[PDB]
Design a protein around this nucleic acid. Structure first.
Length: 61
DNA sequence: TTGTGTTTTATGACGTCC
DNA sequence: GGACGTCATAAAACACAA
């Protein structure tokens, strides 16, 4: 769906920062918010979703 | 350097929506 | 039969004592 002949892609610093800020604001992301964020950062909704899931896991750990 | 231990993307499997 | 949540796990990329 995302993966191809780039197994995984390194997110820019800026992107990462934005995501972190969003996470801090709230740990779950609304569909609308997700859509906005993907639009404004050059990532797919799906990518954003994945990231949030990862981040929650990380927090738990 | 460069091993090697850890972190970041990403997936399928399985679970719960109030 | 979707959407999103967990999780164990693979592989690329990084962090950094040695």
């Amino acid at each position: 769906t995302r993966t191809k002949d780039k197994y995984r892609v390194v997110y820019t610093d800026h992107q990462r920062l934005e995501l972190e800020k969003e996470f801090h604001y709230s740990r779950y992301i609304t569909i609308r918010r997700k859509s906005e964020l993907a639009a404004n950062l050059g990532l797919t909704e799906r990518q954003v979703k994945i990231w949030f899931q990862n981040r929650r896991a990380k927090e738990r750990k």
